[PDB]
Amino acid sequence: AFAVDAAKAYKDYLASGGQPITNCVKMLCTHTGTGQAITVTPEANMDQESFGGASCCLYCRCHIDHPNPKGFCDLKGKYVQIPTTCANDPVGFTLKNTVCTVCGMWKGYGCSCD
């Protein structure tokens, strides 16, 4: 019944002042994109940076199994748009936040469905 909870480990490490995972791969782009959260090509808007998805995925970067019976990664091979205000910690942002299954924006950072 034992499994490592790496998401919690990183969340607590951050909470206690640890420096975020670095070397997330930031892309050059127009910054006139849709602003959707996770895309097949960079889609940052004026308020976002775009990153290569693998480099922003805690499981990819930590060499650990993905939380998924199939182990499928929803970031690798795509681009993640991160609010510029949070781009110091893309891995933390993707862990803590959620994508709206309807409009494809981050809940709280673009999703206007409510």
Partner: protein
Amino acid sequence: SSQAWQPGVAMPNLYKMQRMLLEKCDLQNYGDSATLPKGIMMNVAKYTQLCQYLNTLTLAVPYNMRVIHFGAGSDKGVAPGTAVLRQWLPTGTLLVDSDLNDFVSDADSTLIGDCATVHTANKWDLIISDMYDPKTKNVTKENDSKEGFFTYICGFIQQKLALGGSVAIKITEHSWNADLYKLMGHFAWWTAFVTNVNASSSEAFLIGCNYLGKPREQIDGYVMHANYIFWRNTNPIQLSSYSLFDMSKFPLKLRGTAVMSLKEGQINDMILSLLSKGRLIIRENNRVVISSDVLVNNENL
């Protein structure tokens, strides 16, 4: 002086035609650092400028294009060049990458190990290599043609590059190979391309554009590398990151280039003309299968 607004500078044709002897490379801005946009890694800027230049050539871009990228890892364990290539290439393009050392990648498949362990059934439409031997820094004699991964790359090109396909293989003053230059003459066109962000380095990408599978031109590669160093030695390039700011036309155009299987007997001059113009790829269009050779040892006793 408009060179600064380009992605970089390609070796002018008149320097290719010379017969120079090899000198030491002595760049006036050697090692100077470009000012990159905030938070952008060198390899992202470098690969962006490489792709921007490749947008000016006649690359074949088929549906289900196949691209392989050697030397794709970093000491940081991520793959910035692969991320730029996948951004540049049409969505759905099959992208495989590889490196000696472990890294995580946005590529569809990644093989870790010496490139000589990498094998594949299929032919490829574009080959990218950024491999460089750290021991090349231990310069202790005349600058001779290097082997190692360059020997693999030449064979891989001759064996596994589709006709019409293209390559970009990173070289430097001391990281180079005479047979790779010679093989540039087996393409419809070739150059040595220096990125504006790394204009202070003797790095260049040797680009073969539209592979013909036979020599169009006989190139002595010892002479051509000397020509390249001569060009670099006498043509200072000012560092520039200007082109990084305009990404509106960055994506590689999906040309839908035709793929045909054809046997070595059906390649006539009209076919060769289509290949030369970026208008045809010739290879099987089967499924893509790759593998890494694994050496087995039991170290007990």
